[PDB]
Amino acid sequence: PKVVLLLTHSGDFFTIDRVAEAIEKKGATPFRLDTDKFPLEVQLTAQFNGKKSFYQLSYNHQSIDSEQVQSVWTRRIWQPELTGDLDPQFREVCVRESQTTLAGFWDSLRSARWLDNLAQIEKAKNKLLQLRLASEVGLIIPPTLVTNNPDAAREFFSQVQGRMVSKLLTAIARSMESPEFFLYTSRVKAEDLEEAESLRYCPMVFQAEIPKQLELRVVVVNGQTFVGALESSQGAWQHHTLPDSLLQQLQIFMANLGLNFGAFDFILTPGGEYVFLEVNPGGEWGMLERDLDLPISQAIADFLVFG
Amino acid sequence: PKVVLLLTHSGDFFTIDRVAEAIEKKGATPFRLDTDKFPLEVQLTAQFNGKKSFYQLSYNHQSIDSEQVQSVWTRRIWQPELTGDLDPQFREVCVRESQTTLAGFWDSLRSARWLDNLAQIEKAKNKLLQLRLASEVGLIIPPTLVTNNPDAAREFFSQVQGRMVSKLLTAIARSMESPEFFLYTSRVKAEDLEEAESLRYCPMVFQAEIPKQLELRVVVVNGQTFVGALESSQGAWQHHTLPDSLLQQLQIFMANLGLNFGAFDFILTPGGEYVFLEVNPGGEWGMLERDLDLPISQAIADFLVFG
Numbered sequence: 001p002k003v004v005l006l007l008t009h010s011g012d013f014f015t016i017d018r019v020a021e022a023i024e025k026k027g028a029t030p031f032r033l034d035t036d037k038f039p040l041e042v043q044l045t046a047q048f049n050g051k052k053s054f055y056q057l058s059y060n061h062q063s064i065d066s067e068q069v070q071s072v073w074t075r076r077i078w079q080p081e082l083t084g085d086l087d088p089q090f091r092e093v094c095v096r097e098s099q100t101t102l103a104g105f106w107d108s109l110r111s112a113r114w115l116d117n118l119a120q121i122e123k124a125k126n127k128l129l130q131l132r133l134a135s136e137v138g139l140i141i142p143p144t145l146v147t148n149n150p151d152a153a154r155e156f157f158s159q160v161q162g163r164m165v166s167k168l169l170t171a172i173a174r175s176m177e178s179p180e181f182f183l184y185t186s187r188v189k190a191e192d193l194e195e196a197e198s199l200r201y202c203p204m205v206f207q208a209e210i211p212k213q214l215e216l217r218v219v220v221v222n223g224q225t226f227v228g229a230l231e232s233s234q235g236a237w238q239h240h241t242l243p244d245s246l247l248q249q250l251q252i253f254m255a256n257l258g259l260n261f262g263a264f265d266f267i268l269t270p271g272g273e274y275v276f277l278e279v280n281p282g283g284e285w286g287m288l289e290r291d292l293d294l295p296i297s298q299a300i301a302d303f304l305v306f307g
Numbered sequence: 308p309k310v311v312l313l314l315t316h317s318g319d320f321f322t323i324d325r326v327a328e329a330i331e332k333k334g335a336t337p338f339r340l341d342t343d344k345f346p347l348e349v350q351l352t353a354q355f356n357g358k359k360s361f362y363q364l365s366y367n368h369q370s371i372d373s374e375q376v377q378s379v380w381t382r383r384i385w386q387p388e389l390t391g392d393l394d395p396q397f398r399e400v401c402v403r404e405s406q407t408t409l410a411g412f413w414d415s416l417r418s419a420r421w422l423d424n425l426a427q428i429e430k431a432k433n434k435l436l437q438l439r440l441a442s443e444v445g446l447i448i449p450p451t452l453v454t455n456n457p458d459a460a461r462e463f464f465s466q467v468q469g470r471m472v473s474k475l476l477t478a479i480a481r482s483m484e485s486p487e488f489f490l491y492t493s494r495v496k497a498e499d500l501e502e503a504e505s506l507r508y509c510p511m512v513f514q515a516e517i518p519k520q521l522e523l524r525v526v527v528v529n530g531q532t533f534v535g536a537l538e539s540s541q542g543a544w545q546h547h548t549l550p551d552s553l554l555q556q557l558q559i560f561m562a563n564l565g566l567n568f569g570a571f572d573f574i575l576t577p578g579g580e581y582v583f584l585e586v587n588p589g590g591e592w593g594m595l596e597r598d599l600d601l602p603i604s605q606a607i608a609d610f611l612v613f614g
Binding site: 049101 | 347393433
């Protein structure tokens, strides 16, 4: 009942600092676990006899056990950082046992309050489920195809009435002066071919390019909503008010993903329709808070320390 | 409402044949999807406009769409078979988009009856959660340690009263005359060191060796139980009756994993105590059915076609 576990990457700064400070101003104690640093710099131990099976965690000369953890913040769950040119089977077993051990430790925290529960996060990461559920709840989506059939993709390029089509893929953005990195959906233009031997029969996600006057970033924390907008014309986030009908749909989308935290990307078309693009793959909200003074970290701390 | 989807590996024979035939004797139509053959030989397509977003599946010149699927049998969910010496980033994207596309297709079958639902299976695969839950429900487990702290492992070797300790790892068994393969937990004896540079800080699972007069394979299908035993002394499965107190604990274990199908490994000690070892990692039941005429496939077909 005495620490808030904050799960991040070791190269994360602004968002973790704000949440961590908001947590201690509330009276609680945060503990930062860089998940990329397991297993090289983090030790986990658990013993089972049918007694209590609790876990002990050590990281940077600090240590906690699982009954101390009262809430968990899933800022970033990263794959194990493994250094070098390791033999492939040794590597495969290290990575698989590391993931298994971590999953064992997350299960030992099942009674803490999670923002958010890992099973929800893993499911919600899938863009195809997002689109299916968004359209079911009444959100507008861009026409979208997933296929490993080149014929079906060829046919899809003709049904987008007459617009461009892009391929979609999650990527990491790192440069741009600031020393932080972001997860974002890259959009390469689709100009066909049958090459890419190494991707020949591999499925891809294709989506109709939609015209925008605004990009929206909608961050929802436990029923609080925080909205930034960018004017689009090839930026600084600006305030924006969403209609309540859209907010109600977002909550139904969010409760069907089992999530209490979400960052959503929308566009507003010239015609004025809100189009859902995706749950932002990195849950990225730091620019909103600083550029606009939106107290997102406070709402995060509030959920973690008081529900 | 017109096919039972059977998810297997393309090198699976006995178990899929029995279930498939039991299904058609009931009046239903099975459709075999070898998941290892996606994406090279299986085509998946889905289109989203907010209309219906259904999926089309083709495999070996047969095709179905997701509204035809009434039930799904998760015999084997295998990673994508990818052939060759592919460029690592192309490979990484193919594999990640293949998994994403498959997960999209499984979501489109969310209204069919699953044996078992994939979220349960993925969670239940974790041996550490199995042990935690087994001891909570009152099943006896062998003393077990997971750690990447060599000191903690050293200490564990002294607390097993005075028995041998093995390391545990999931592996694939393929030879032994018969042309099928099995998932099983390998047990290498623990004789320490600080080498294995490639596994130096990597967690491992250590377990006290327990004496056995019997190994048990307990297969449960929708509240029906099927038990095989092997006499241990360095075999042919033989009948065995479990006490009802153990059966009640198994059902509580199974309902806490959200599973309607499970293959469990136990040992019976010389002293006569049933010790839980693990949910059999491959759900392996084929030898039981043939060596002992236990109608496991019939119970599987029955669940899939009628609930």
